[PDB]
Curated annotation (Swiss-Prot), chains A, B:
This is Protease. Residues 20-89 form the Peptidase A2 domain. Residues 1-5, 49-55, 88-99 are annotated as: Dimerization of protease. The active site is at D25. Homodimer, whose active site consists of two apposed aspartic acid residues. It comes from Human immunodeficiency virus type 1 group M subtype B (isolate BRU/LAI) (HIV-1).
Amino acid sequence: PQITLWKRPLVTIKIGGQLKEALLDTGADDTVLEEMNLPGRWKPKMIGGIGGFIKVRQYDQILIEICGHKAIGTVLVGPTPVNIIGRNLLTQIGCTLNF
Amino acid sequence: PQITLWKRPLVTIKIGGQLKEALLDTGADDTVLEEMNLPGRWKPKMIGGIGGFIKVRQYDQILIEICGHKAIGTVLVGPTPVNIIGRNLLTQIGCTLNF
Ligand SMILES: CCOP(=O)(COc1ccc(C[C@H](NC(=O)O[C@H]2CO[C@H]3OCC[C@H]32)[C@H](O)CN(CC(CC)CC)S(=O)(=O)c2ccc([C@H](C)O)cc2)cc1)OCC
């Protein structure tokens, strides 16, 4: 679709078989989700944002469906204030900015 | 233009008479710029993201030109690690997400 920006670009995603709401975030290199139970092995990772760095769990090659588009890639889990879909997955679903 | 997301969506802006590089950021409600001494009155604010909060100065009705498209709105100034163009200005230049 075409998504305007008068409101937050919130979408439904499906991950680990459950539905969640997430923000499409072009300013994010990486996809970061709030604390959740995900199957599979993970490694500790650190990621930095506007306020400094946080500890996350890095899950590789995870299946995620974003508004009905399939992606497979890295998902970070940790104390983000909001679930964010970053560029690593936006590129897989063919997202561009246009103006 | 059309901006793909393989790399950070960095563009040149003009603000307070100066040229800067900034990120087109659909995950940001508001625009946040690197420390700059802008004329005019401001109000203090705290803004939060990954890692916590930072203290900024809120300036109203600031003109910014983004790739030659003019926008007017609120800008937050402070020690952000990157210049962020948020939705308050992206909507003015007609920016959409498309996939
Ligand atoms: C030189 C680089 O330095 P660092 O690595 C960090 O640099 C940065 C720092 C921030 C960004 C942009 C931000 N992306 C981000 O956090 O992305 C994460 C994931 O992927 C990583 O890629 C880039 C960073 C990592 C978000 O797009 C926008 N944010 C919203 C929230 C949603 C609420 C995100 C959770 S917000 O900026 O917090 C914010 C908060 C309030 C407001 C006003 C109030 O509306 C405006 C903006 C990009 C690069 O320094 C580490 C110390």
